[PDB]
Design a protein around this ligand. Structure first.
Ligand SMILES: *[C@@H]1O[C@H](CO)[C@@H](O[C@@H]2O[C@H](CO)[C@@H](O[C@@H]3O[C@H](CO[C@H]4O[C@H](CO[C@H]5O[C@H](CO)[C@@H](O)[C@H](O)[C@@H]5O[C@H]5O[C@H](CO)[C@@H](O)[C@H](O)[C@@H]5O)[C@@H](O)[C@H](O[C@H]5O[C@H](CO)[C@@H](O)[C@H](O)[C@@H]5O)[C@@H]4O)[C@@H](O)[C@H](O[C@H]4O[C@H](CO)[C@@H](O)[C@H](O)[C@@H]4O)[C@@H]3O)[C@H](O)[C@H]2NC(C)=O)[C@H](O)[C@H]1NC(C)=O
Ligand SMILES: *[C@@H]1O[C@H](CO)[C@@H](O[C@@H]2O[C@H](CO)[C@@H](O[C@@H]3O[C@H](CO[C@H]4O[C@H](CO)[C@@H](O)[C@H](O)[C@@H]4O)[C@@H](O)[C@H](O[C@H]4O[C@H](CO)[C@@H](O)[C@H](O)[C@@H]4O)[C@@H]3O)[C@H](O)[C@H]2NC(C)=O)[C@H](O)[C@H]1NC(C)=O
Ligand code: HEM
Ligand code: HEM
Ligand SMILES: *[C@@H]1O[C@H](CO)[C@@H](O[C@@H]2O[C@H](CO)[C@@H](O[C@@H]3O[C@H](CO)[C@@H](O)[C@H](O)[C@@H]3O)[C@H](O)[C@H]2NC(C)=O)[C@H](O)[C@H]1NC(C)=O
Ligand SMILES: *[C@@H]1O[C@H](CO)[C@@H](O[C@@H]2O[C@H](CO)[C@@H](O[C@@H]3O[C@H](CO)[C@@H](O)[C@H](O)[C@@H]3O)[C@H](O)[C@H]2NC(C)=O)[C@H](O)[C@H]1NC(C)=O
Ligand SMILES: *[C@@H]1O[C@H](CO)[C@@H](O[C@@H]2O[C@H](CO)[C@@H](O)[C@H](O)[C@H]2NC(C)=O)[C@H](O)[C@H]1NC(C)=O
Ligand SMILES: *[C@@H]1O[C@H](CO)[C@@H](O[C@@H]2O[C@H](CO)[C@@H](O)[C@H](O)[C@H]2NC(C)=O)[C@H](O)[C@H]1NC(C)=O
Ligand SMILES: *[C@@H]1O[C@H](CO)[C@@H](O[C@@H]2O[C@H](CO)[C@@H](O)[C@H](O)[C@H]2NC(C)=O)[C@H](O)[C@H]1NC(C)=O
Ligand SMILES: *[C@@H]1O[C@H](CO)[C@@H](O[C@@H]2O[C@H](CO)[C@@H](O)[C@H](O)[C@H]2NC(C)=O)[C@H](O)[C@H]1NC(C)=O
Ligand code: NAG
Ligand code: NAG
Ligand code: NAG
Ligand code: NAG
Ligand code: NAG
Ligand code: BMA
Ligand code: BMA
Ligand code: CL
Ligand code: CL
Ligand code: CL
Ligand code: CL
Ligand code: MG
Ligand code: MG
Lengths: 324, 324
């Protein structure tokens, strides 16, 4: 697992060695505009299948994503969505490129796999319930623009993030009878809304105000603006507290029908990051791998260790298969 | 310019042969900040505790891996209100002739000890200014930190301990300090500070956010790094502050001339309005110290207000109290 950038100042990353290209048939793109754009500028394999080490070097070098967040997000995703023997992860749909599957109920389903990492009330993608959880959706993007106009002076910023995050949750509650918003997804849904203001903003300026042309380029086409400079120093979810505090929300879920959102008092929330860590490892990962062979157990323990090092709140390490 | 981010920001020995702890030698100034005190006491900063903004940022980054945005934000904020803008020198403690000849009233140039500019109420290990001394280590407060760590962190200080102690300290001040104030700048900074010991005082080889009480006392009381201390393995500052905020959500306010009269102030900024915090700091705090400044002082203010703006986490739009 790579350490932080050696030299992490702003610099042009839309450069000569990293041109955008269109998708070839077979090139895999998914629900993350950050990984998508990196793949499309060749910071990641252009076909969208990568090792964890590759994804981490790419997000730091391409966009100056900080090391702790890159390590948390990448090994969390690899544990639930990736192939632990081959050490590969698809950034979108399940693919044979990741090699021979483990036994069920592990899915190795790529970032597109619903319920594991990816989840509901995304900004520019529709819920899995309605059929397609990974393609750019134009109606939701035009909503992001609207809110930018109304709260951001035409630009996306943390204030807009706060408003739209809530709007999307409300939208899901009213329309999605499967709406779920607990645990891992509750956590990551709020930190994602800060990323575009933090990281899609040209680094020479770095003033957290994202223009709509830049926003469309990343979200829709996986493409950096012309002459794009990365952020002037490493960061990820700075300001998430702005987005949480705008519209206080307790973790919960619709119960088999629309508008039935019911708080779940067993879910972690922001005051309990280590319950969220423990349930991810001790319930989510453990249920995908309830009885691993010696070889799989050893791959699981190595990735669980690397995952534990990226956990922002620190926490106490949990061992689903033992320390041995 | 402010220094940019650290070249190679990995974990490494920082309590080394070139940076030993030394006892205070009269002349030497120590203040309310255990981070800055300890850096001065190991020679990362000047040992007498008076430094330029550039020295302080280089010191917090190289000594402790404090991240660049936070180092710039705090350093220029404190310099604007507590420092000498003409000599370019800031005391980490008391007001001193070592920062040079003063500007005109009503500027104070009072050092970091100056109550209510940067320093303020409900500190963890230091008493409120109202009771007499806002900067000395207070053994009864540290013992209550040790007690909350036994109760909530298994004997170690971590973000769960921080959430409970931060709220305890606020309740102590409401009950005992008739002047307690907890608005605007202080309301914002108080929360982030409670994360720093978990993120930054924990040996960088471990980096699991569990701070032992011997390490904690070393930094807070003696201004000394633990033996063989490694700084954190990448840059960070207020990671996990939302964990502290959401443990006991609370709005900004003040006692109203007597104990137990905490009154929410609806004109204060809070965590959802970080740009109003920025703006009030500049329009009100800074500009009432320097209501009408001469030509050279006006240049120095505008230069430092620029650097300050670049450090604002939320991004925001720049305000210009003296024009552009
Ligand atoms: C190092 O720092 C420490 C701490 O800052 C310094 O010591 C402090 O010094 C100040 C200044 O002298 C003292 O201020 C004075 O406080 C007294 C009140 O004392 C008693 O009540 C205190 C508050 O308790 C309530 O709130 C807390 C916090 O939530 C809570 O835990 C308590 O249980 C109680 O809560 C109430 O409300 C709750 C709802 O939230 C309810 O559940 C509950 O039912 C309660 O009703 C308390 O902390 C204090 O406890 C200490 O002292 C006793 C022994 O006396 C000891 O047994 C405890 O273990 C503690 O050690 C007391 O119980 C107040 O009366 C004074 O008010 C006078 O003066 C002010 C200011 O001038 C005037 O405005 C008033 O009108 C009045 O004349 C005063 O404000 C502070 O109490 C003290 N704290 C300590 C010692 O812990 C120390 O000085 C510093 N050292 C150095 C060297 O500087
Ligand atoms: C992102 O970009 C925006 C614009 O550049 C920045 O500026 C903030 O913009 C916000 C959002 O529009 C402003 O907040 C709004 O201000 C309105 C007026 O505020 C004053 O006047 C009213 C009287 O009408 C007073 O009551 C109030 O106390 C203020 O003195 C308010 O009417 C708005 O409140 C209401 O809005 C919604 C609309 O959907 C209502 O439904 C609610 O009831 C709500 O109460 C709103 O607060 C804000 O003033 C701007 N801030 C500043 C400092 O200028 C953001 O700063 C920028 N963000 C970042 C992180 O960069
Ligand atoms: C570090 C490896 C990363 C992984 C494994 C990862 C994975 C994901 C996944 C699976 C989603 C979908 C969540 C949802 O359902 O909405 C997502 C969303 C998101 N990602 Fe990433 N991501 C990573 C890095 C990045 C980077 C570097 C950026 C920005 C620089 C970023 C920006 C975002 C944003 C803005 C979304 C939300 C998009 C939306 O809601 O429309 N990600 N990420
Ligand atoms: C970068 C320049 C910095 C400045 C200008 C600065 C200034 C301050 C000031 C004025 C206070 C007192 C606030 C109060 O409690 O009343 C404070 C508190 C504190 N600082 Fe800093 N600080 C800096 C860097 C850091 C660093 C690098 C660390 C640790 C790595 C740190 C750790 C803390 C902690 C833990 C407190 C609270 C102490 C307490 O509540 O007992 N600071 N700082
Ligand atoms: C709304 O949520 C429900 C409940 O999660 C979704 O139904 C579930 O769909 C999954 C995935 O297709 C099913 O699990 C699979 O079942 C097949 C064959 O039945 C099995 O061979 C697979 O290995 C896997 O078990 C499952 O039947 C079902 N879960 C239930 C009923 O608890 C439902 O599809 C969602 N609705 C929409 C429109 O998305
Ligand atoms: C992009 O996202 C938008 C908004 O989230 C999706 O639009 C939604 O589409 C449904 C139908 O697919 C619209 O309502 C439908 O109305 C009929 C009545 O004839 C009803 O029988 C259906 O059950 C359904 O309710 C819905 O109003 C619309 N929501 C909007 C516009 O806010 C859209 O499907 C997404 N695009 C893609 C390609 O998925
Ligand atoms: C606590 O605040 C009080 C009230 O603001 C202060 O004392 C008063 O305020 C001014 C100072 O600005 C004094 O000149 C008045 O005589 C005081 N009395 C009243 C009724 O206003 C005082 O500055 C603070 N006390 C301490 C110890 O810091
Ligand atoms: C702070 O340390 C404590 C103990 O090491 C951790 O708290 C425990 O959390 C477990 C599950 O992780 C719960 O059963 C208890 O509520 C906790 N034990 C207690 C309170 O004695 C806590 O997670 C740590 N916090 C962080 C952020 O690392
Ligand atoms: C511009 O600022 C200067 C001070 O830098 C002002 O000087 C005033 O001097 C009087 C003398 O009694 C003081 O009492 C005031 O406090 C000072 N004013 C201020 C605002 O601090 C001078 O008056 C100001 N000139 C203009 C045109 O505003
Ligand atoms: C702080 O001061 C600035 C101006 O120095 C404030 O006023 C706004 O400034 C912008 C930028 O030039 C103008 O577009 C607006 O027209 C200004 N408003 C007014 C009423 O003139 C800003 O609002 C101030 N903020 C606070 C909280 O005091
Ligand atoms: C506008 C503002 O910031 N006012 C605070 C106030 O709420 C508090 O009562 C006062 C005296 O202790 O200190 C001021 O700094
Ligand atoms: C670090 O990165 C930037 C952009 O390449 C450059 O300005 C700076 O000198 C580099 N520092 C080095 C290579 O030491
Ligand atoms: C996970 O397992 C660990 C150790 O066996 C245990 O401490 C913890 O309670 C478990 N977590 C849950 C939520 O069951
Ligand atoms: C291991 O036990 C779990 C119980 O959760 C079961 O699902 C899994 O199939 C078991 N595996 C064996 C050894 O095949
Ligand atoms: C840079 O960090 C690496 C990572 O551990 C380390 O090996 C090396 O000693 C550092 N380089 C310098 C010049 O300090
Ligand atoms: O143990 C070293 C390697 O182990 C694998 O399991 C991976 O997931 C890598 O990221 C790691 O570098
Ligand atoms: O530009 C005015 C001020 O700028 C600062 O950065 C310092 O270097 C000072 O020496 C000077 O007073
Ligand atoms: Cl980093
Ligand atoms: Cl530099
Ligand atoms: Cl940094
Ligand atoms: Cl005492
Ligand atoms: Mg989604
Ligand atoms: Mg204080």
């Amino acid at each position: 697992p790579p350490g932080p950038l050696e030299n992490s100042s702003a610099k042009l990353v839309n450069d000569e060695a990293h041109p955008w290209k269109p998708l070839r048939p077979g090139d895999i793109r998914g629900p993350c505009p950050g990984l998508n754009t990196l793949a499309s500028h060749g910071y990641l394999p252009r076909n969208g299948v990568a090792t964890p080490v590759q994804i981490i070097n790419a997000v730091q070098e391409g966009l100056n994503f900080d090391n702790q967040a890159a390590v948390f997000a990448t090994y969390a995703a690899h544990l639930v969505d990736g192939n632990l023997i081959t050490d590969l992860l698809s950034i979108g749909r399940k693919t044979r490129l990741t090699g021979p599957d483990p036994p069920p109920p592990a899915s190795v389903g790529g970032l597109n796999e619903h319920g594991t990492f990816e989840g509901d009330a995304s900004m520019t993608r529709g819920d899995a319930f309605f059929g397609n959880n990974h393609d750019f959706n134009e109606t939701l993007f035009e909503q992001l623009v609207d809110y930018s106009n109304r709260f951001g002076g035409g630009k996306y910023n943390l204030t807009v993030a706060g408003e739209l995050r809530f709007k999307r949750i409300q939208d899901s509650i009213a329309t999605n009878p499967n709406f779920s918003f607990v645990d891992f997804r509750f956590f990551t849904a709020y930190g994602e809304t800060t990323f575009p203001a933090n990281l899609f903003v040209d680094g020479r300026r770095d003033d957290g105000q994202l223009d709509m042309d830049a926003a469309r380029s990343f979200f829709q086409f996986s493409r950096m603006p012309d002459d794009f400079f990365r952020a002037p120093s490493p960061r990820s979810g700075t300001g998430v507290e702005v987005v949480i505090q705008a519209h206080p929300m307790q973790p919960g879920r619709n119960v088999g029908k629309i508008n039935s959102y019911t708080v779940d008092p067993t879910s972690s929330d922001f005051s309990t990051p280590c319950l969220m860590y423990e349930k991810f490892v001790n319930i989510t990962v453990k249920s995908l791998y309830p009885n691993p062979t010696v070889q799989l157990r050893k791959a699981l323990n190595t990735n669980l260790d690397f995952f534990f090092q990226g956990v922002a709140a620190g926490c106490t390490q949990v061992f689903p298969y033992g320390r041995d």
